[PDB]
Amino acid sequence: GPAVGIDLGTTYSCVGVFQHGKVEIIANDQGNRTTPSYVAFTDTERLIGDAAKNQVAMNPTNTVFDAKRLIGRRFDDAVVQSDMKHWPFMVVNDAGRPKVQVEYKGETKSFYPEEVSSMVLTKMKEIAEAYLGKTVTNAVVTVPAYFNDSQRQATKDAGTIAGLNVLRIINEPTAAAIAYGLDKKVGAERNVLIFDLGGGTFDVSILTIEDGIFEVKSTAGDTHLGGEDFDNRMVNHFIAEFKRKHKKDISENKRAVRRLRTACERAKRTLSSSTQASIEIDSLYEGIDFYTSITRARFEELNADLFRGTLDPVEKALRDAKLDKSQIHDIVLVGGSTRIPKIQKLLQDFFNGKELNKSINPDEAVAYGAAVQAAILSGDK
Ligand SMILES: Nc1ncnc2c1ncn2[C@@H]1O[C@H](COP(=O)(O)OP(=O)(O)O)[C@@H](O)[C@H]1O
Ligand SMILES: [Mg+2]
Ligand code: NA
Ligand code: NA
């Protein structure tokens, strides 16, 4: 059948298929080309993707996300212990392994991270089957370059649990480079910087590609910096505004804050292609409408430190790879946040004007390369 590429992302996942000489990135039921890596459990059902994210404020302790932060890890991992303080859902210890614990159909139930990720993968599989009209079994699934064997194995296991035949687990920066055919240029080695700014994580990778070998020279970044932080800055901005205008602090009203957050995320996306964005929320709080706007300049100002700060891991990656800026053949934009004009300007300026590879939607580039690899491994390329 058709082999697919799946980017199983920390915040958003994406599925592509290579057929008839090109990659098609597949839209979900709602027409979205990426799907939130969310699973929710209710009195009646299990929800995955858009439907799960959509009900988070009304069911926060039974709505699971960030499974990628747990997958392949032990409960007593410092990372797991630290991350747990920022999740509304329970994480419990089963004989050393972390499990998310939720209420579901009126009973208490627990799931391993790879079970939760299996559900997201099931959804991605179903998305592909809905479009293709065919059973989808074979897949290439991607992971961050720094993932160890426990994390890779658990990611593969998530696929197996979802009934996927995982052809290979490949690195996200490798998938991005494959998408751009940077392994197929007429020449010897190519030094490639992958600048991946996603929803919750920032990954910089330097690869040296030669003879079909994607040597990881260095990785850097911030596992807790992404688009969510920019949204947070916007949310705080508007909470303060509403307090001034109406003498109401909406902060502890989970539904109101969530609706504001959704509006902010949308506005952010709009600001990547327009110089201003409208915020339009009926009855944000006590029936009070919240209709206003934000300029691209104000968004950039709110986030100025965070945007500039992405360059520090780039310098670090270069130093650790023992390469000058000028030795980089290709710069590749990955992750939805790299659509931000200010981020692109900062990075291009940092490379003293060098053109960026960004023709492939950055939030789709990983899935794109995974789809190409899947075709190669299934003999369809
Ligand atoms: N046009 C855009 N402009 C700015 N941010 C965007 C845009 N499109 C998506 N994003 C942001 O990208 C982030 C998701 O990145 P993505 O790479 O899809 O996920 P992940 O990091 O989970 O792989 C979210 O914070 C989302 O708001
Ligand atoms: Mg990603
Ligand atoms: Na993604
Ligand atoms: Na990332």
Q: What is the amino acid identity at position 231?
A: D
Residues 6+ apart with CB under 8 A from 246: 285, 288
Residue 176 near residue 366, CB atoms below 8 Å = yes
Specify the CATH superfamily of domain 185-225+310-357: ATPase, nucleotide binding domain (3.30.420.40)
Our answer on whether the CB atom of 196 is closer than 6 Å to any ligand 1 atom is no
Token pair of 118, please?
């299996």
Residues of the chain with CATH 3.30.420.40: 1-64+120-184+358-378, 185-225+310-357
Q: Which residue has the tokens 């009209």?
A: 133
Rounded to whole angstroms, the Cα distance separating 199 from 335 reads 8
Q: Give the method used.
A: X-ray
Distance 65 CA to ligand 3 centre (A): 13
7 burial (CB, 10 Å; 0-12 / 13-18 / 19+) is buried
Residues of the chain with CATH 3.30.30.30: 65-119
Residue 130 near residue 56, CB atoms below 8 Å = no
* DSSP-assigned letters across all residues of 16-31: EEEETTEEEEPP-TTS
Distance 67 CA to ligand 3 centre (A): 13
> Which backbone phi and psi does 124 adopt, to 5 degrees?
-65, -45
**Angle at which helices 311-321 and 341-350 pack, to 10 degrees?**
40
The SS3 of residue 120 is helix
379 burial (CB, 10 Å; 0-12 / 13-18 / 19+) is exposed
Our answer on whether the CB atom of 174 is closer than 6 Å to any ligand 1 atom is no
Nearest ligand 1 atom to alpha carbon 226: 25
**Angle at which helices 149-161 and 113-132 pack, to 10 degrees?**
50
- Which of the following is catalytic: 83, 114, 115, 172? 172
- Which of the following is catalytic: 24, 53, 66, 68? 68
Please work out, in degrees rounded to the nearest 5, the angle formed at the alpha carbon of residue 376 by the alpha carbons of 23 and 332.
55
Please tell us whether the domain made up of 65-119 is placed in CATH 3.30.30.30.
yes
> Which backbone phi and psi does 163 adopt, to 5 degrees?
80, 15
Architecture of domain 226-309: Alpha-Beta Complex (3.90)
Question: Any idea which fold 1-64+120-184+358-378 has?
Answer: Nucleotidyltransferase; domain 5 (3.30.420)
Our answer on whether the CB atom of 157 is closer than 6 Å to any ligand 1 atom is no
Identify the sign of the CA torsion 136, 159, 33, 144: negative
The SS3 of residue 221 is strand
Our answer on whether the CB atom of 24 is closer than 6 Å to any ligand 1 atom is no
Rounded to whole angstroms, the Cα distance separating 221 from 207 reads 15
> Å resolution of this model?
1.8
Name the binding residues for ADP: 11-12, 199, 265, 268, 272, 336
Helical spans, DSSP H, in the chain: 50-54, 78-83, 113-132, 149-161, 172-179, 227-246, 254-270, 296-302, 304-309, 311-321, 341-350, 365-377
